Design a protein around this nucleic acid. Structure first.
Ligand SMILES: [Mg+2]
Ligand SMILES: [Mg+2]
Ligand SMILES: [Mg+2]
Ligand SMILES: [Mg+2]
Ligand SMILES: [Mg+2]
Ligand SMILES: [Mg+2]
Ligand SMILES: [Mg+2]
Lengths: 319, 108, 190
RNA sequence: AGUCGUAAAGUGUACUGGAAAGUGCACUU
RNA sequence: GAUUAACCCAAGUCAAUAGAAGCCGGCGUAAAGAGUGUUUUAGAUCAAAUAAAGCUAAAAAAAUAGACUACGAAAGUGGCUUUAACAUAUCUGAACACACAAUAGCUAAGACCCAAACUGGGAUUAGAUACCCCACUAUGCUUAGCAACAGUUAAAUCAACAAAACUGCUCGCCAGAACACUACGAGCCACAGCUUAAAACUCAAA
């Protein structure tokens, strides 16, 4: 399968009409070899349906097409790259389906046929997502898709679709952080009670043609058959955010803020005691089972008190 | 150091010397457990003939078999001496040729 | 024991049993009988005389702790270590101590003063040669006790066991720390 | 490795869920 | 590897092992010397501070003086008045004694004008501003807790680079990479994660 040569940075500057190399405001991975590595780590893609986000110049696109995919849905925001992607599509007829639009609003649930939809408890449904997006867009995207897994909608109408996304090295570590680690944070819990998350490898900044001052991690997500917390996404998000707002103080200092001041002291204690959270646990020392306990007790407290779930302590400190 | 400090500390005290693979003995008797070959560290390239042996002290050790061609098999008795094989890391023992089962190198 | 002391120990409420077992003298034939002896309440197994055990290999202490865990498992004891979530006899922890050398006693006190569930009275059950009295003397002279005087004669009091004439020692203890931010010790006959 | 490709500014520390690095506090030239 | 020839020792030769064989040398940058003062058995010869009360002028913290360089052991001290008040007639000598001082990080309570990591909300390109605006947390606040000393400039000063070299006298410290690496294990946890190490070993370097 012969494909067009990859565009060098010269052609890319000419294409974006910048006429210089220090005005891109973007970093491109123009190394087909690292992209081969990433597509290898994404799994066995033979006759797979790949939803590739943030195509850009097309190193990831070329790497994926080199693997024997069936359909490769591309979603590009910029129109200066559609010409190159159209040349790629013509070089490999029938495999590249290009679309123009934002990945944060694009509806993947209708993109692929309904004959690929496997049940949730069965194997991942032969539909993969691969992404090298701006880090300013991959974090909202992963939050949105985590909500989708919690609701079993969106890209996960086909089942437990696997994701391979590039994040910043720190963000990737935090996504794949263990209990007690110095990178354990909100993002770790939020990703980990819904997915098996693996930080596979780190690409140094020197490998990107405009070299960034950061490293880039590649992280693989596989939705879990049995989520570790069976509560609504927004409730878990609220609990985790209030726990982790004070990362270096005891866990109760952050949990007291879920309740109005009037009943802060007694309600916080009731929460902790109907859970079994030792109040000397600092937030990085809480496993997903501690958060499951807190979420269950908090769901109860909300269900016998309607006003609670909408409470925001800063809206009460304003007055 | 001042004279008072040297009087306090006293004469220099050389640490006890380290015992080598032979534990301070000229040679050691050993039983061959298995024969194999190892590759040198790389300014060099070869397949050096080595064998694992259980020494009379009970410890197991890797030994280098010098010369071209050896007929060592398992359970055979050998005498091993000191001397590092410079290109093999961790191989500090050498088999003595012409003693017990390990015979002399065949002429040519 | 079953006809005199078990009645008081099967009164519902907040309670804890510090069952003490001699490490040298294992298996313990008293272990399968605990469900009837103490009832369905929280239980901590304390392996005593660990200092008198030769160190066969590194990590022998972990092997002893595991062995105690399977010994509890063989009997019909519920093993619920650590955080469990929001009845029958339940073993919360297995802790090796040595009352003579005071090895693991301070860590035992810290563990007892760190959780929500270790609230209420403590009942130090055990066998005769388990070494209960040494542990009672050790725990008596510590911050664990709410001392009103220094002399151990007044700090601990003698009381007749309920429903019997068995006079036994007791000293008053502190509630664990979580119960101030937002109860008596008991030695039972061996 | 090529029988591979190509042409005001800093230092720490803390948090970071719109992190191709940002902000906050303290310092240096 | 064989062969020829040469070299050394020689009734021996010499492979392994073990001894013999070594600190009066240094501590800015190579391994090694500062938080401050007092005292201490010995050794040596070198016998505009600080704390209290009061009081304030421009706009709680102190413009001018201050181009001053004083006080204090150090950190630090520069609005006015008053009251106390600024150890010691040789030097070196504390991990362990007494006073202070600063730097992290958590724990309790308390104040909250203002600012403000995080967290929400508003506006903006065509991956908007990471950057603008609003609101409000942790926090910033307040308590209570966890090389020395004396003399020399004479000499070739002088591995270099710093910071011209010196003596004497005393204390502390230093004898390859290696303040290496590593979790046999231990604690917390409670099946899967976190925190916590020296030594061997290897090398001819660092
Ligand atoms: Mg930010
Ligand atoms: Mg910064
Ligand atoms: Mg001889
Ligand atoms: Mg140095
Ligand atoms: Mg002195
Ligand atoms: Mg404000
Ligand atoms: Mg000194």
């Amino acid at each position: 399968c012969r494909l067009p040569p990859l565009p060098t940075i010269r052609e890319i500057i000419k294409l974006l009409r910048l006429q210089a190399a220090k005005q891109l405001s973007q970093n491109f991975l123009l190394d087909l070899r690292l992209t081969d590595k990433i597509v290898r780590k994404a799994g066995n893609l033979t006759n797979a349906y790949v939803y590739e986000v943030g195509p850009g110049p097309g190193g990831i696109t070329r790497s994926i097409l080199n693997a024997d995919v069936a359909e490769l849905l591309v979603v590009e925001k910029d129109t200066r790259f559609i010409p190159g992607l159209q040349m790629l599509s013509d070089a490999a007829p029938g495999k590249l389906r290009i679309v123009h639009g934002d990945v944060l609003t694009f509806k993947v649930e209708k993109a692929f046929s309904e004959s690929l939809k496997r049940p949730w408890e069965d194997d991942p449904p032969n539909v993969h997502i691969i992404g090298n997006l701006p880090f300013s867009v991959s974090t909202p995207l992963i939050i949105k898709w985590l909500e989708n897994i919690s609701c079993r909608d969106g890209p996960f109408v086909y089942g437990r679709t696997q994701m391979t996304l590039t994040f910043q090295k720190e963000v990737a570590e935090r996504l794949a952080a263990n209990t007690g680690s110095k990178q354990r944070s909100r993002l770790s819990v939020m990703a980990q009670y819904l997915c098996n998350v693996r930080h596979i490898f780190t690409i140094p900044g020197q490998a990107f043609v405009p070299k960034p001052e950061v490293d880039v991690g590649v992280v693989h997500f596989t939705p879990l058959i049995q989520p570790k917390i069976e509560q609504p996404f927004k409730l878990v998000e609220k609990v985790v955010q209030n726990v982790f707002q004070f990362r270096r103080k005891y866990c109760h200092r952050g949990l007291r803020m879920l309740f109005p001041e009037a009943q802060r002291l007694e309600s916080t204690g009731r929460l902790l005691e109907l859970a079994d959270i030792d109040p000397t646990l600092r937030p990085r020392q809480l496993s997903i089972s501690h958060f499951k306990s807190l979420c269950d007790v908090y769901r109860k407290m909300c269900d016998e008190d309607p006003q609670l779930f909408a409470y925001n302590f800063r809206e009460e400190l304003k007055r | 150091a001042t004279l008072n400090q040297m009087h306090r500390l006293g004469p220099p005290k050389r640490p006890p010397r380290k015992l080598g693979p032979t534990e301070g003995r000229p040679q050691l008797k050993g039983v061959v457990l298995c024969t194999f070959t190892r590759k040198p560290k790389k300014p060099n390239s070869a397949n050096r003939k080595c064998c694992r042996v259980r020494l009379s002290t009970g410890r197991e050790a890797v030994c280098f078999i010098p010369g071209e061609g050896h007929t060592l098999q398992e359970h055979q008795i050998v005498l091993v001496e000191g001397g590092r094989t410079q290109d093999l890391p961790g191989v500090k023992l050498t088999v003595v040729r012409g003693k017990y089962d390990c015979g002399h190198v065949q002429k040519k | 024991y079953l006809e005199l002391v078990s009645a008081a120990l099967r009164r519902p409420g907040p309670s804890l049993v510090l069952y003490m077992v001699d490490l040298l003298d294992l298996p313990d034939a008293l272990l399968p009988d605990l469900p009837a002896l103490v009832g369905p309440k929280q239980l901590i197994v304390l392996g005593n005389k660990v200092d008198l055990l030769p160190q066969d290999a590194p990590g022998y202490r972990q092997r002893l702790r595991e062995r105690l865990w399977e010994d509890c498992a063989r009997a019909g004891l519920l093993l619920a270590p650590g955080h469990q979530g929001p009845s029958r006899t339940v073993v919360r922890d297995v802790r090796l101590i040595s009352a003579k050398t005071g090895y693991g006693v301070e860590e035992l006190i810290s563990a007892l003063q760190r959780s929500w569930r270790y609230r209420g009275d403590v009942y130090l059950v055990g066998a005769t040669n388990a070494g209960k009295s040494t542990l009672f003397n050790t725990l008596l002279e510590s911050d664990y006790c709410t001392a009103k005087g220094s002399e151990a004669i007044d700090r601990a009091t003698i009381s007749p066991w309920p429903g019997t004439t068995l006079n036994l020692l007791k000293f008053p203890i502190c509630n664990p720390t979580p119960y101030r931010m937002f109860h008596w010790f008991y030695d039972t006959p061996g």
